Amino acid sequence: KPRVLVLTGAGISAESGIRTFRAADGLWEEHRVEDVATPEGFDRDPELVQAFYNARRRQLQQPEIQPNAAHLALAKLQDALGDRFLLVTQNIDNLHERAGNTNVIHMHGELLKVRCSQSGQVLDWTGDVTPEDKCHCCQFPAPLRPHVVWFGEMPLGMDEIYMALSMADIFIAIGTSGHVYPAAGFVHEAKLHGAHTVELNLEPSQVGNEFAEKYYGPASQVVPEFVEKLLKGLK
Template sequence: MKEQLEDIIGQVYQKERRNLFTFLTGAGISSDSGIPTYRGIDGIWVKDTQFHKPEEFGTLRYFKEHPEEVLQYALFRKKMFENAVPNESHFELSEIENMLQDRFHLITQNIDNLHRRAGNQRIYEIHGNNREIKCSNGCKEILVLPEEIKGKDLEEDLTERDVTLLTCPTCGHWMRPNILWFDEYYDEKTNKRFGSLKVAKNSGVLFIVGTSGATSLPIAIAETALKYGAFIVDINTEDNNFTDLIRDKKNAVIIRERSTDVLKTIKDIIQNLH
């Protein structure tokens, strides 16, 4: 594994064009921080221990029918994220960015803010984030979630003040988390659709870490990187949708080891070149 990575990283490091080192991360990279995956067996639990499948609960349709329930859950997740701390994989990526500077880009499906807290700055959050809110009725402005709104325990209801602060100041409809739901489409403003594909086009290598490729834009990012000649390195503990895409490609490597160990190896290789 190390020799393959040394060869790939060495080639990309010497390139003058399409020389970006791009990392695509998903929920698996945050599991060591205690954050359950969205589709995991723990699923989504809301108050009264009512269980919902993510594909049903995580939709704009469900939000419009049950806005307070979804917002209460979003604030429960907010507290979970705030109580979590970045893990070793997050910090390895931060150190890699410090070495590569503008040749580094991080595309993440995670909304948990742990990459930023670990120190990464060149980030494309393609599923949105938990720091921001926007109008559920389509008003264009994206706002920072007011600091006054605190994370909640699972059984806590919204306060009157929460309701006021989560009302759109323009049209009076509910504000909603600035994240991508299952019945929505990727765009540029919230999801950096075109920006992330441009990064993929200019990548010399795309490292896929802790994501199965269950949604369309991550797969499109990998397809674009392949089309323009990038190496693809699939770092996951199990085969996934990316594996099917790259299995027979000569410029692809499949690694079935812990992300922390592989990222440390990548960091050490770059450090030696640097």
């Protein structure tokens, strides 16, 4: 069976009711990315940034938010391929996990985790983060921050991701904008190592022309259709 690397972005979770920033205006929930997703923004107005991620974290866990058929299809793909499948996501939601995928690399972190600003240790966290919330991993308790990678910070799991990029027979980018690096450059890396590259998206990404195979439309229709095609090809 081929080695398959999937990269997902915000597009796949749009139908589930989770929005993201837009290059059209450069706004995430009508906030400038500078203010809610940079280390400077956090330093300038920690109250606002914690409030922002508190709102995102609460909204993620509302009953109307559910994985969609695209998430479910990727779980079936992992079921079929086992160890020869890897899912890397730019998303900070937990919808891949709720769909049944395991060993997901969250390269930009996770909304349902916080991190000790001192030790870097990570905690599961489903509620609000308030100023009174400090770590329990340090002798001198330190403030908690969202375990979310901000612009200007290094993504998580990059060594493992680049290993997979050089190993993949098929690289599939799903729901990515082509505007966020290094993730948007992964297709170039995959191609260099001889991978067959596929884009599945609601609309073409900036780097769409670099993909060998491309399908566009609602993720909940396009992704199950491609996964079915791929699984049938495997006999």
